[PDB]
mmCIF file of C-alpha atoms and ligand atoms in Angstrom:
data_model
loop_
_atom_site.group_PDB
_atom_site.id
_atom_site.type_symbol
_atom_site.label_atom_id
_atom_site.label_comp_id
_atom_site.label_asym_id
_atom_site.label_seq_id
_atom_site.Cartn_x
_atom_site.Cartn_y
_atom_site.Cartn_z
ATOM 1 C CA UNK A 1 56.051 63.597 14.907
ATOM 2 C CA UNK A 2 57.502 64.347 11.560
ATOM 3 C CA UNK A 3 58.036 60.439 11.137
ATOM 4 C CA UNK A 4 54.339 60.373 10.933
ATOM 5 C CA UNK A 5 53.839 63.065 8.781
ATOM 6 C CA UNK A 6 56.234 61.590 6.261
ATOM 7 C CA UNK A 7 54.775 58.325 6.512
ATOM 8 C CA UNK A 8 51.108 59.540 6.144
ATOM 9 C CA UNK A 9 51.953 62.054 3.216
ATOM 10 C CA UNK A 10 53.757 58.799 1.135
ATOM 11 C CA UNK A 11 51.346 56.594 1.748
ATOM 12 C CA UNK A 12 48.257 58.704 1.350
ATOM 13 C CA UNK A 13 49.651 59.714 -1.953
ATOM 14 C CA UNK A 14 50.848 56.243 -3.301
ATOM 15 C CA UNK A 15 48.560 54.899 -6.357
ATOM 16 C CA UNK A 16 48.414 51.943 -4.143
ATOM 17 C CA UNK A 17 47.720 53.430 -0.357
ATOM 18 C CA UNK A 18 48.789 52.008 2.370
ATOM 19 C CA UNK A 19 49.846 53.102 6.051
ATOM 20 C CA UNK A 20 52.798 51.758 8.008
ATOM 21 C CA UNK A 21 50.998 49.740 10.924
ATOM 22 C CA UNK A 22 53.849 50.634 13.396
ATOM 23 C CA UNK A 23 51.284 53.595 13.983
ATOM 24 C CA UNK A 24 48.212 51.219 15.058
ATOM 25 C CA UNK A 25 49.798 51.620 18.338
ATOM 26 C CA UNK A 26 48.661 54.566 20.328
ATOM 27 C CA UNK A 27 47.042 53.834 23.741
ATOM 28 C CA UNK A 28 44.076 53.238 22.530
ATOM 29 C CA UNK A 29 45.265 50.479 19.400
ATOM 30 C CA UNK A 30 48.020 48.634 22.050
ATOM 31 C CA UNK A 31 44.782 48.281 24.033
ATOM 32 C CA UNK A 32 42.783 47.335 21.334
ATOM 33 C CA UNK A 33 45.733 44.800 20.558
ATOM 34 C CA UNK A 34 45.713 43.221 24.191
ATOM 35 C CA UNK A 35 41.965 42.583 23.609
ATOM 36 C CA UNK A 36 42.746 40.568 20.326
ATOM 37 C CA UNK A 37 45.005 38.170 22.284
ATOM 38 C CA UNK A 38 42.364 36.618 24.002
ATOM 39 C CA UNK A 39 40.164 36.440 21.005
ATOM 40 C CA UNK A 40 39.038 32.911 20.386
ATOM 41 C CA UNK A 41 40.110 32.907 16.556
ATOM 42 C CA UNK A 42 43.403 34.433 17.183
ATOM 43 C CA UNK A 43 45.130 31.609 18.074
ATOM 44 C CA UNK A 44 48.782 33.080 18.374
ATOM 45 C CA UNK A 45 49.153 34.373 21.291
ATOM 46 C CA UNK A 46 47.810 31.103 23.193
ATOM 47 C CA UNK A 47 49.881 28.806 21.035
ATOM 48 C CA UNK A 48 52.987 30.996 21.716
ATOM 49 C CA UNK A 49 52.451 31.104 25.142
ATOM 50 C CA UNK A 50 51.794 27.295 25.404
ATOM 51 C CA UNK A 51 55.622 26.711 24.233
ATOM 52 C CA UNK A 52 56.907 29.202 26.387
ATOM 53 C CA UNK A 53 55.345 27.491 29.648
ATOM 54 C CA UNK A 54 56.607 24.096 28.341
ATOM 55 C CA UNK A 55 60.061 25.507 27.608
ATOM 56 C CA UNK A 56 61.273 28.636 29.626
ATOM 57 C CA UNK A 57 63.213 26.803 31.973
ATOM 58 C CA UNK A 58 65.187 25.008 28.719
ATOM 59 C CA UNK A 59 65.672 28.638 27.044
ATOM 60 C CA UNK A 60 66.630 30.011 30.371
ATOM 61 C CA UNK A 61 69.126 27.011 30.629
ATOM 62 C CA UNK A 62 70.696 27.410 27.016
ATOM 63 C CA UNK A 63 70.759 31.223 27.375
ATOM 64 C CA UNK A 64 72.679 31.965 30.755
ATOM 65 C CA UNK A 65 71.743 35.154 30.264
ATOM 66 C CA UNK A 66 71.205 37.509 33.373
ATOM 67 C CA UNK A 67 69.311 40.544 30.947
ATOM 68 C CA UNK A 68 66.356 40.039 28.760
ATOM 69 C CA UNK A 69 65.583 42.611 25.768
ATOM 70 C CA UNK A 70 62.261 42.564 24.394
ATOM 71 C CA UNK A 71 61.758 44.134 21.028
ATOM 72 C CA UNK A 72 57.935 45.002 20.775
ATOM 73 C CA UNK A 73 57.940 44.245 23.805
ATOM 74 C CA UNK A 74 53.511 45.630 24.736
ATOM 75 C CA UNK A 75 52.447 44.647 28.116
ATOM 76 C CA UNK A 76 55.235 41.895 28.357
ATOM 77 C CA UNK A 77 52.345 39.207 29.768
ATOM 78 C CA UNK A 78 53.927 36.184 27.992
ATOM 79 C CA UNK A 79 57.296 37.675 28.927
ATOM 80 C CA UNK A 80 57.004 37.083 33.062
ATOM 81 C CA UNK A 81 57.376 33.112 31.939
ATOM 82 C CA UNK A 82 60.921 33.855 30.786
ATOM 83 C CA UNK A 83 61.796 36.106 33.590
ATOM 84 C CA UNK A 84 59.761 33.846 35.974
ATOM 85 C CA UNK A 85 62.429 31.234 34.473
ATOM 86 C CA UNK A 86 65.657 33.125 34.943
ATOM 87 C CA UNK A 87 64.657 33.834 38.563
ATOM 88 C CA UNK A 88 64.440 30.782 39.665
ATOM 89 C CA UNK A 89 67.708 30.009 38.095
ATOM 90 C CA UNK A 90 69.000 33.258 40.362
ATOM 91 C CA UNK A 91 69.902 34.550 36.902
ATOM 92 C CA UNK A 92 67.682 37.739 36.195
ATOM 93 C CA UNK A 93 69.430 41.083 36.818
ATOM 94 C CA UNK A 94 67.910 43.087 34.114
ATOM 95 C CA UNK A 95 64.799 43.798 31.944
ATOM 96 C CA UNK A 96 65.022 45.785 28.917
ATOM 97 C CA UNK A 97 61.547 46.395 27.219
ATOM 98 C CA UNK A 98 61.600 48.063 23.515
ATOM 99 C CA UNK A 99 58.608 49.385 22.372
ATOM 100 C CA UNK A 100 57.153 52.481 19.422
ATOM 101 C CA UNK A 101 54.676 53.101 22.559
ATOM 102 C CA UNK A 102 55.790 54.914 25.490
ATOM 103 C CA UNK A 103 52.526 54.413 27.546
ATOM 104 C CA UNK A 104 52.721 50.171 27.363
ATOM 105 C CA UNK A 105 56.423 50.860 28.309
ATOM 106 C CA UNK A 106 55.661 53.036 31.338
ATOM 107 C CA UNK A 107 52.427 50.132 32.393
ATOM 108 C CA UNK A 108 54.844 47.119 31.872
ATOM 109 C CA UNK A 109 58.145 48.640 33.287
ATOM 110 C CA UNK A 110 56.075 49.834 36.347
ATOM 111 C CA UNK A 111 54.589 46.447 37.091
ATOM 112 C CA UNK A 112 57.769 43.955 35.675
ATOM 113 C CA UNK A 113 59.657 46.590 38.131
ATOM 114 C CA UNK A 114 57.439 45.364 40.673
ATOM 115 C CA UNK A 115 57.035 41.912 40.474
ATOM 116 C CA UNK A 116 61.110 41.248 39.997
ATOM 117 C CA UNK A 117 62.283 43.329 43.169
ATOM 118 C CA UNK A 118 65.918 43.664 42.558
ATOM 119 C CA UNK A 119 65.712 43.579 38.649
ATOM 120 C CA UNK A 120 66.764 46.606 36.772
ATOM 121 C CA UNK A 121 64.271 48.110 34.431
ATOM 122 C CA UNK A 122 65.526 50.424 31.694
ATOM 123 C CA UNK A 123 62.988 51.088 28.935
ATOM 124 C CA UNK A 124 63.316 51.721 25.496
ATOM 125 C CA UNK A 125 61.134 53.943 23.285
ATOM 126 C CA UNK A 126 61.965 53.524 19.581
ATOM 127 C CA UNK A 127 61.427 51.925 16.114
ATOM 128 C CA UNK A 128 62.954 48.354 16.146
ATOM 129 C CA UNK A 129 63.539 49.076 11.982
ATOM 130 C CA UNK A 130 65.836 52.160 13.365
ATOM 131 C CA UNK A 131 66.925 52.464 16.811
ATOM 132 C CA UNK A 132 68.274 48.998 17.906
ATOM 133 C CA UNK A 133 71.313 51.034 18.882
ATOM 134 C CA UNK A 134 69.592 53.149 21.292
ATOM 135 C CA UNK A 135 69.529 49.208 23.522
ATOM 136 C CA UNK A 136 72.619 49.433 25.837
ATOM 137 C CA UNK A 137 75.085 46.507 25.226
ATOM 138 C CA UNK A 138 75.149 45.498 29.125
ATOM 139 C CA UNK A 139 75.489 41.851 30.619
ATOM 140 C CA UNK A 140 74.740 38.713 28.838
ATOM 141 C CA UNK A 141 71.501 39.188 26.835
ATOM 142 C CA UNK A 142 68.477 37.211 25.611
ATOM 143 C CA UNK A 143 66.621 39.426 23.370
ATOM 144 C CA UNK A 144 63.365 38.162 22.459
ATOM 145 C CA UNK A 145 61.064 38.916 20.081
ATOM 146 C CA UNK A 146 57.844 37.254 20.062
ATOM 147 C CA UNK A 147 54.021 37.413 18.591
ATOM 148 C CA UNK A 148 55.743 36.978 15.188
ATOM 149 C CA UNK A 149 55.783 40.706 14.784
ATOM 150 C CA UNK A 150 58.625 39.755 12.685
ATOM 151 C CA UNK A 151 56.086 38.823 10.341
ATOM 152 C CA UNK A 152 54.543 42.436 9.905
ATOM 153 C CA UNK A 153 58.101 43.535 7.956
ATOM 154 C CA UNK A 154 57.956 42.332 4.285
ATOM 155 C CA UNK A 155 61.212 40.420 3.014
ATOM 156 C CA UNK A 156 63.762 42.915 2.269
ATOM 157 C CA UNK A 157 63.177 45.017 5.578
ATOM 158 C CA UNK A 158 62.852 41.903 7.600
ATOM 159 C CA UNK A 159 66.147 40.621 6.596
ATOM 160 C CA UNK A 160 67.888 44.162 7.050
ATOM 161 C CA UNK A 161 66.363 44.264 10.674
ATOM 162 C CA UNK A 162 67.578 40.684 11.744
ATOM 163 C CA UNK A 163 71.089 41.155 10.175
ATOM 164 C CA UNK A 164 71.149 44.763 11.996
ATOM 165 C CA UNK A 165 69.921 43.265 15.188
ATOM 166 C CA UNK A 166 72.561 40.080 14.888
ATOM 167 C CA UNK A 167 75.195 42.465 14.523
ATOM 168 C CA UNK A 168 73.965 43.627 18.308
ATOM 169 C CA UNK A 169 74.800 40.176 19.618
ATOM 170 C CA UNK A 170 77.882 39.411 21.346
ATOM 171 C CA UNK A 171 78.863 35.819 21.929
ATOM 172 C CA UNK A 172 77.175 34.608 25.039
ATOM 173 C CA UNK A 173 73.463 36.576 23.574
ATOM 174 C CA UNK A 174 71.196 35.041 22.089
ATOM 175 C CA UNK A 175 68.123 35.611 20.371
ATOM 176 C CA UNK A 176 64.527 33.839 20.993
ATOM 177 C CA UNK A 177 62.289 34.304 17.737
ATOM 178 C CA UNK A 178 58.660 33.570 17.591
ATOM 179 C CA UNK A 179 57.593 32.898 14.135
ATOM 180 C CA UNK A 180 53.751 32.050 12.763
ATOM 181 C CA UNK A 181 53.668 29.027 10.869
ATOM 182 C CA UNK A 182 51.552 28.790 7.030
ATOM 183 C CA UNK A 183 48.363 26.603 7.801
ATOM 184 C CA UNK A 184 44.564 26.256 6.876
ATOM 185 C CA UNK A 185 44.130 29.109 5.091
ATOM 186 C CA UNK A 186 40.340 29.878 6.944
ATOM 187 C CA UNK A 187 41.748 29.940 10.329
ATOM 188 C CA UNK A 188 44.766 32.629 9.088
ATOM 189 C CA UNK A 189 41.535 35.043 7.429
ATOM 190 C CA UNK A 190 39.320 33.988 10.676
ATOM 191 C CA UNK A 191 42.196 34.831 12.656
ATOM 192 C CA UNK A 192 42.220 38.525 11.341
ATOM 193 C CA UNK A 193 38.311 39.056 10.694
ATOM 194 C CA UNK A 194 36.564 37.948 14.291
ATOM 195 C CA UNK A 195 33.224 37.835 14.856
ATOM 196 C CA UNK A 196 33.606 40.016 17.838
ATOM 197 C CA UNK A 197 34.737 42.992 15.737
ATOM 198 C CA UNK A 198 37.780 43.917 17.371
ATOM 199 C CA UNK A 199 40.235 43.265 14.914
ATOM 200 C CA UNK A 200 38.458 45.961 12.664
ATOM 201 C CA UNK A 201 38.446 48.533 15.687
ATOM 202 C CA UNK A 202 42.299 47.938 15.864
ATOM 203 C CA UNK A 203 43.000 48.379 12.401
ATOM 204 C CA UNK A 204 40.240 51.772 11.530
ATOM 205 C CA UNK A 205 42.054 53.326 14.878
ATOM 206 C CA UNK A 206 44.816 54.362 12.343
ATOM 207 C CA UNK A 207 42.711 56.858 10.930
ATOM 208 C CA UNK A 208 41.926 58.070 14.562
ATOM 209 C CA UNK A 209 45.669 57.921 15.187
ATOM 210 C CA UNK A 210 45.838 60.226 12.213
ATOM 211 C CA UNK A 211 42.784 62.519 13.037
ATOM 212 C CA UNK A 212 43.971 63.496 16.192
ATOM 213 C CA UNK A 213 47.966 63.818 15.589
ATOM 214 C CA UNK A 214 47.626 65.164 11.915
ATOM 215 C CA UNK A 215 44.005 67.007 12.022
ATOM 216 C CA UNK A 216 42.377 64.283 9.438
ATOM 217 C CA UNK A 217 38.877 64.019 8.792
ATOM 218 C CA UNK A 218 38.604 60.344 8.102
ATOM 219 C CA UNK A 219 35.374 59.032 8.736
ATOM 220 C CA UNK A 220 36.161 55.560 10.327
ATOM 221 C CA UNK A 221 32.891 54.041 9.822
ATOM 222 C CA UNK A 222 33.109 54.733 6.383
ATOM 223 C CA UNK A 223 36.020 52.268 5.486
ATOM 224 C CA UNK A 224 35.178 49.002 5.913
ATOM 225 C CA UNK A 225 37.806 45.897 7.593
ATOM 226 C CA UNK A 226 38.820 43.727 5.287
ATOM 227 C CA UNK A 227 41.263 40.566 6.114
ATOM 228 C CA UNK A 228 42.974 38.272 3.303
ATOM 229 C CA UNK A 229 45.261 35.954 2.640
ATOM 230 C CA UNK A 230 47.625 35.977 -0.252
ATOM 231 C CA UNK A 231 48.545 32.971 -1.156
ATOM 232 C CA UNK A 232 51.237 33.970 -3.424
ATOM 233 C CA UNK A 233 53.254 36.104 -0.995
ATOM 234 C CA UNK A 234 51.896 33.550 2.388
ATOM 235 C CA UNK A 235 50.790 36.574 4.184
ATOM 236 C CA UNK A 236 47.645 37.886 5.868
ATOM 237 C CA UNK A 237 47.211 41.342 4.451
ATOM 238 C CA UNK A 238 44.666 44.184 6.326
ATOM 239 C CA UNK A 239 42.723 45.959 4.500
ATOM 240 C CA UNK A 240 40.789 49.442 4.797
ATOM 241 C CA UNK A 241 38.333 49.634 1.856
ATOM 242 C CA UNK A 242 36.500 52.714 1.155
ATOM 243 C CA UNK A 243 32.266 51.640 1.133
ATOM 244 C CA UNK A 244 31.787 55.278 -0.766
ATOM 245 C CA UNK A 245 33.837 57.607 -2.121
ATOM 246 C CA UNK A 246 35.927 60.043 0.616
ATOM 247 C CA UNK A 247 37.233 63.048 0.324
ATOM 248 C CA UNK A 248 39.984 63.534 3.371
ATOM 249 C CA UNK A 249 41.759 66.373 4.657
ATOM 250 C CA UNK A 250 44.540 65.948 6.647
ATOM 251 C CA UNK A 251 45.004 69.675 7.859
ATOM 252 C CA UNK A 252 48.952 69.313 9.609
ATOM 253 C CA UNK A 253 50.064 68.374 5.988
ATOM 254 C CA UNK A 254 48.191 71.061 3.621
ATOM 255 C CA UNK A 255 46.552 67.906 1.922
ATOM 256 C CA UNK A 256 43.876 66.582 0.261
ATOM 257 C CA UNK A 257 43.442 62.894 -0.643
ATOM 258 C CA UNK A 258 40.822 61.214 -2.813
ATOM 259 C CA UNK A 259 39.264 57.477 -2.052
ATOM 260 C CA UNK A 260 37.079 56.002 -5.205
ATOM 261 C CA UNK A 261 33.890 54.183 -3.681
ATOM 262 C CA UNK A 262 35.561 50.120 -3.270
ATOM 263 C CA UNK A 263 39.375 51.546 -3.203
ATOM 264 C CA UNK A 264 41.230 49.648 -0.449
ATOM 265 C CA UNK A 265 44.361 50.657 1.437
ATOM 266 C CA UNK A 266 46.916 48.165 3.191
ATOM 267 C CA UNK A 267 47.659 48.786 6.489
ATOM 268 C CA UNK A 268 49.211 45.604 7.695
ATOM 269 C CA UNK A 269 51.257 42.637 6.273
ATOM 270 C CA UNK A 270 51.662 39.256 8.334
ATOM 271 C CA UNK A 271 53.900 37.238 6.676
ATOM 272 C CA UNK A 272 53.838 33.596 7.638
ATOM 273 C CA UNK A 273 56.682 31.213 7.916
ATOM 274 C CA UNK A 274 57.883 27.349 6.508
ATOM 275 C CA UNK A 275 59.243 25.986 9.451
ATOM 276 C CA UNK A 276 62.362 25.085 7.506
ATOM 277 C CA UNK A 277 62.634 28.934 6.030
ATOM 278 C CA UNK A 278 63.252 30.072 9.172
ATOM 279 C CA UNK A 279 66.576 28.340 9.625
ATOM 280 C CA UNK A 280 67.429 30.131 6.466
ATOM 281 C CA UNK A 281 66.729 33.629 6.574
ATOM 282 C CA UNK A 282 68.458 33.404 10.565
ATOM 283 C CA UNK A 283 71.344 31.957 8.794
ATOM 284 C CA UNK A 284 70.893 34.766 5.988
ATOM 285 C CA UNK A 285 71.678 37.079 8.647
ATOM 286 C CA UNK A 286 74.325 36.007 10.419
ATOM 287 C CA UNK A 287 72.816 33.565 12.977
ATOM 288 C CA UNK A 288 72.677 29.619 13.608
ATOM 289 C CA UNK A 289 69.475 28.861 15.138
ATOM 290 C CA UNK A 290 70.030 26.499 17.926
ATOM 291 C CA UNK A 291 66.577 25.083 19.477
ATOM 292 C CA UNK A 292 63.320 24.967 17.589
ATOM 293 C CA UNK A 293 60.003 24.246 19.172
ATOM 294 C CA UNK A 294 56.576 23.941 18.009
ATOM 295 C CA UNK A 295 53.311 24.026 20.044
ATOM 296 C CA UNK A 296 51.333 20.618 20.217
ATOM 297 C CA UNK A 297 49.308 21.496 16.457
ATOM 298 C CA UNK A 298 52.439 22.811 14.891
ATOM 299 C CA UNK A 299 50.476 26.355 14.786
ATOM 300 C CA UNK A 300 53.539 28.128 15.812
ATOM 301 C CA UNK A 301 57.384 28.257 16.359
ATOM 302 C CA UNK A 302 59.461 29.457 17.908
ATOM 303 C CA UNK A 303 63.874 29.614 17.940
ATOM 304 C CA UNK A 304 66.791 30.270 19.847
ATOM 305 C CA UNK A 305 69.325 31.294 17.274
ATOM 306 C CA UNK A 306 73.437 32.502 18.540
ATOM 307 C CA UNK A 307 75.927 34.006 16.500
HETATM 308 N N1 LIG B 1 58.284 49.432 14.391
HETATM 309 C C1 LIG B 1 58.096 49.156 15.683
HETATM 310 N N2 LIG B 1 59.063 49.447 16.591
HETATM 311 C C2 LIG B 1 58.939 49.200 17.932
HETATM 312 N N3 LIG B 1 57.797 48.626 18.404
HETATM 313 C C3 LIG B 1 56.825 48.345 17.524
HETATM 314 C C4 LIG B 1 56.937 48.566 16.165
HETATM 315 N N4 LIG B 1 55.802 48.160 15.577
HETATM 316 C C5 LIG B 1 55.004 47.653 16.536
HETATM 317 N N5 LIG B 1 55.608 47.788 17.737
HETATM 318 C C6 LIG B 1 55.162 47.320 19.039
HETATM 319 O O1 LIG B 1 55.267 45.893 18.993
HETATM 320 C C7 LIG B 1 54.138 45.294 19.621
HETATM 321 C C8 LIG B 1 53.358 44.468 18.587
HETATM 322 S S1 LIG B 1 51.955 43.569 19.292
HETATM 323 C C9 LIG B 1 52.920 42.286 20.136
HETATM 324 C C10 LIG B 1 52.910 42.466 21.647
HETATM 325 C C11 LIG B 1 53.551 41.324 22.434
HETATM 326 N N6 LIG B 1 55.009 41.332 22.257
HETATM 327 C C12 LIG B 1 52.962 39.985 22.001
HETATM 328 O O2 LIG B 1 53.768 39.104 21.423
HETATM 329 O O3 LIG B 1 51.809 39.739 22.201
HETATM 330 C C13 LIG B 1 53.311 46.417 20.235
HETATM 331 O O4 LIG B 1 53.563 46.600 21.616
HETATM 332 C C14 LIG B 1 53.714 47.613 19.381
HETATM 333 O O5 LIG B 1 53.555 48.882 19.988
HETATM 334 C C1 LIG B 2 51.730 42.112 16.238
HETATM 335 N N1 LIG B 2 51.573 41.273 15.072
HETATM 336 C C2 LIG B 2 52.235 40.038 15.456
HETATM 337 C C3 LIG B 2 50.157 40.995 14.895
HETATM 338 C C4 LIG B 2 49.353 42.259 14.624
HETATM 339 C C5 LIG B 2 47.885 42.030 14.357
HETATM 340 C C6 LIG B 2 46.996 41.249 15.008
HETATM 341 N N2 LIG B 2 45.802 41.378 14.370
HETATM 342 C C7 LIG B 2 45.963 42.232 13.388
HETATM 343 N N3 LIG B 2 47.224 42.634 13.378
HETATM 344 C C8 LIG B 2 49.927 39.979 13.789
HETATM 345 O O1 LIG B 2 50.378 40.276 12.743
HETATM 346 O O2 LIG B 2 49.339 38.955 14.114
HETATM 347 CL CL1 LIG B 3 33.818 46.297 8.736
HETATM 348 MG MG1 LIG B 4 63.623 33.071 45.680
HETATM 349 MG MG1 LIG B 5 30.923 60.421 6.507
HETATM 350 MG MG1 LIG B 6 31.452 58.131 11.259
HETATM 351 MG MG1 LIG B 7 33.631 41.705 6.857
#
């Protein structure tokens, strides 16, 4: 609660506004996020899923591990391939979801729980940019850490957190990394702006998230989506842009903020990744990638990576 307040109050007050998109995920945005995955122009979470059909069993094989750690973790639907993977190798004795949103935790440990009779489930509630600690150090771990999510830290917090989390491995854990690859720059924007509108839902249900928790009265049909990609940086950016001028009071904070008619605020980064890059900020931190794979249109990648 007061790690929203500080977060809103900074970046309502910013020249440049912007909101930390950890917050998009409430029940109703993690929702709204499960719906983009099937989205025809979002192509990552099919081409990430391709790989891992093609490859658990090799992961599962080069791991050994008998406990797998997701970090940002959500409903954990790609996941069941791994665990799928380490069952049949009468390997899986533990699942360890990580996740900002208690409700997708209590869904996905309920069901995982289910589904893996005999598997321990011990969820996780915290920031993955703060409480990495709060993950017991127990067995022989693959953490994971897929949907490039990764990719919605900028540089100089995304190599603290993979340095931080490679300082969690032991020798016998490893790490699986899914990473989205620079391409055609319409099918990143296209990827981000569908024509089904539910990529804008997902990123306006911020201000809900901020109405209801910190008594806000942003009008969300007032700010309009806006997706783009910066070329200079390689990143998708999301955009809320203002279509008049708004006066906003956000009552838990005693504060007033100002939006000029056409003033946009970030609310998301997705970096994207050179294949070869990625070998270099893992070894940046600490860690010697081990496998790479790509999906059959290079879209996406994904690595193993050891200390
Ligand atoms: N800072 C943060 N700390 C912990 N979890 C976070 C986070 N920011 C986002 N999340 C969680 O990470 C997930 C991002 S969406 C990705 C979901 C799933 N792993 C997939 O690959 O499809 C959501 O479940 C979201 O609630
Ligand atoms: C979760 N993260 C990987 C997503 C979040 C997202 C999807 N659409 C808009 N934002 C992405 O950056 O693609
Ligand atoms: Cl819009
Ligand atoms: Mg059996
Ligand atoms: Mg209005
Ligand atoms: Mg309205
Ligand atoms: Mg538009």
């Amino acid at each position: 609660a007061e790690a929203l307040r500080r977060d809103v109050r900074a970046g309502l007050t910013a020249t440049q506004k912007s909101l930390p998109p950890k917050w998009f995920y409430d029940a109703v945005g993690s929702d709204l996020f499960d719906q983009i995955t099937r989205l025809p122009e979002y192509y990552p979470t099919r081409t990430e899923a391709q790989i891992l059909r093609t490859r658990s069993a090799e992961i599962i094989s080069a791991a050994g591990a008998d406990t797998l750690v997701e970090l940002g973790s959500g409903t954990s639907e790609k996941t069941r391939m791994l665990l799928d993977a380490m069952r049949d190798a009468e390997l899986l004795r533990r699942f360890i979801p990580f996740d900002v949103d208690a409700g997708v935790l209590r869904s996905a440990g309920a069901a995982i729980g289910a589904e893996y009779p005999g598997i321990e489930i011990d969820a996780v509630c915290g920031d993955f940019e703060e409480h990495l600690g709060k993950i017991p150090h127990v067995g022989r771990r693959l953490v994971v850490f897929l949907g490039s999510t990764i990719g919605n830290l900028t540089p100089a917090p995304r190599a603290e957190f993979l340095s931080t989390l490679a300082d969690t491995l032991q020798p016998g854990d490893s790490l699986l990394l899914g990473t989205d690859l620079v391409k055609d720059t319409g099918r990143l924007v296209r990827a981000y702006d569908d024509a089904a509108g539910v990529t804008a839902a997902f990123n306006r249900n911020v201000l809900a998230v901020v109405n209801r928790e910190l008594s806000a009265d942003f009008d969300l049909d007032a700010f309009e989506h806006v997706a783009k990609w910066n070329s200079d940086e390689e990143r998708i950016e999301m955009w809320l842009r203002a279509r008049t001028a708004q006066h906003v009071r956000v009552a838990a904070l005693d504060l007033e903020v100002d939006f000029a008619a056409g003033e946009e605020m970030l609310t998301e980064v997705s970096c994207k990744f050179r294949p070869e890059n990625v070998v270099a900020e893992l070894a940046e931190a600490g860690l010697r990638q081990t496998h790479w794979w790509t999906d059959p249109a290079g879209d996406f990648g994904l690595s193993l990576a050891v200390r």
